[PDB]
Amino acid sequence: SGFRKMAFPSGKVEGCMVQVTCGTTTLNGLWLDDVVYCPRHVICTSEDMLNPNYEDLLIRKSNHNFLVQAGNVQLRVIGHSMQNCVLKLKVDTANPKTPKYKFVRIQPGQTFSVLACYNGSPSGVYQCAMRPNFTIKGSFLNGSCGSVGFNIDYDCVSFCYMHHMELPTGVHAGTDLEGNFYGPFVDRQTAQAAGTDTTITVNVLAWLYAAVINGDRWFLNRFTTTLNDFNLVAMKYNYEPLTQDHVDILGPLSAQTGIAVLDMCASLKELLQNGMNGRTILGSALLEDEFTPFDVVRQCSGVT
Amino acid sequence: SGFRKMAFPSGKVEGCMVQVTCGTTTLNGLWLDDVVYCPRHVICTSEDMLNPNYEDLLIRKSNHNFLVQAGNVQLRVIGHSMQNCVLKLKVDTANPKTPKYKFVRIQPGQTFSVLACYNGSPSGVYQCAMRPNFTIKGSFLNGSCGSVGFNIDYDCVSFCYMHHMELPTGVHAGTDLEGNFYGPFVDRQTAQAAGTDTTITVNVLAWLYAAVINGDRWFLNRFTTTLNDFNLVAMKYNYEPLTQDHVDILGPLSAQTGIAVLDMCASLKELLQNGMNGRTILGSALLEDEFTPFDVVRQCSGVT
Ligand SMILES: O=C(Cc1cccc(Cl)c1)Nc1cncc2c1CCCC2
Ligand SMILES: O=C(Cc1cccc(Cl)c1)Nc1cncc2c1CCCC2
């Protein structure tokens, strides 16, 4: 028993991290097979970042201008190209540590682990959720660009995120591994509105089931509700509307605990309307939304 | 910016995990050089665990009874011995993936990453604190025994914890890598009193400095206090007494923010006496104590 914000073991991803330097900028790259992926802003200087013309800036660059280092060995760059906001540096050597991998575009509300890196070296790992507004509330410093988010399915790493920038509000923005930004963000130093965020209802409910599984049952009540009645409460408290698809994904957790989904919805309704009354749930004094129903089942069953 | 419960990259530890089977029990082992370390209760059956005579139980076991598997290759056991509550299985092959390592006995209040494992395979990684009462509030299921806690200093892994058991209260108990239990715990199925726990004051203060560094300054006030006055408050709220040694370790954070340690103590005093008033600090509605002053500086500077 116990419930923690658990990240995937980062080993397979650590073996892919490289340092990419272009001119005076150094950031992280992901070396998979004979290709190194990194944010395209590696080709800019502080003068360029207000409104960069990436096509023009990339034209002034040749293969020999991109310095790629894996630990202490230099990789030879034989090709370079830009795909959306990522650069793809073809190197002459396939990464011997390349794991079985996929590039996936995760959905808002889904979770993933981040391996924060500086100068191609891993510093730490943490679990994140892609916010409904397509930002991530990560922990990143200068030099962290190019650090990636991923999930692991037994031996396969699905890379879902590459870190690009911190918004003036302290939240983080980035791309999928094809270079497409999550959200409306662009890679330039400008004020950028992150949309209105909401709490991931299905994840909060999944976390309430995790609490029941781990002995925390104080919040359970004698009430039930309907999808319609619950959604009126979710509306008032900036929670995502709950659908039958969400109920269906909560099926395994409903079966494990013997607490019907709408009865758990009634517990959530009372917690939203009344607060916690100074009590805690799984060591938290607020409603946690960064655990999916899958994360809860995985952590409560032991999938390796 | 941003602040997360960050674990160390687990790669160096993943390469050490093996499966150890003895009779009908399977748990995890740590393969370092030509030795496999695992909890000694691997030699017991459910009949034995009420009050095991480990010396006698180990006598009925020969090298060939300990089945050690690293992924899919079988290791040949050439020696076995018991050191406190750990078994040391000498194998004929040094682990080629053995990192630079140390065995350390961490102090209560210190933090470390845990790599939860099942059948010698890593499933997840999370950051923990050794509670003042020598328990850890981890996330462990059946088969997790032998999973280890560690810290990483550039290339050196300091192993500090091996998981042994879950107490009837849902908290976790284990040993250092010499087999000595943290706390008064014994490896037998009996009711075992975990002592009164306290909040790690120095860590809460370190986390308040992390909040200031990351823009959360609402809790800062016009007040100061003294070590004596603050310790009276800490006494009432089951917080560890603050000493000049704690003030000294908070020196770097005091210098970074320009907020004197005793002024931060006065903020903590008001938060303890008044609560949060429905507000949050770094995404938490309670006072976090599982970040040391070192963890805060590391996460806020970028040590890899
Ligand atoms: O945001 C950027 C650079 C940048 C500027 C403008 C556009 C783009 Cl795409 C990238 N790097 C960064 C990433 N994550 C965190 C922190 C930083 C830099 C300050 C410290 C925090
Ligand atoms: O506690 C034990 C077995 C055990 C029993 C008595 C003494 C000793 Cl040293 C070890 N294993 C375990 C570890 N962590 C978590 C969970 C479990 C088993 C139930 C599920 C949770």
Side-chain angles (χ1 to χ4, degrees), chain A residues 41 49 140 142 144-145 163-166 187-189, chain B residues 1:
Chain A
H41 71 254
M49 290 309 306
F140 291 117
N142 209 311
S144 67
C145 305
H163 184 55
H164 282 243
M165 64 170 186
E166 181 171 287
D187 49 0
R188 60 172 73 111
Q189 187 62 235
Chain B
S1 92

Side-chain angles (χ1 to χ4, degrees), chain A residues 1, chain B residues 41 49 140-142 144-145 163-166 172 187-189:
Chain A
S1 92
Chain B
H41 71 254
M49 290 309 306
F140 291 117
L141 303 164
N142 209 311
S144 67
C145 305
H163 184 55
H164 282 243
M165 64 170 186
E166 181 171 287
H172 305 106
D187 49 0
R188 60 172 73 111
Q189 187 62 235

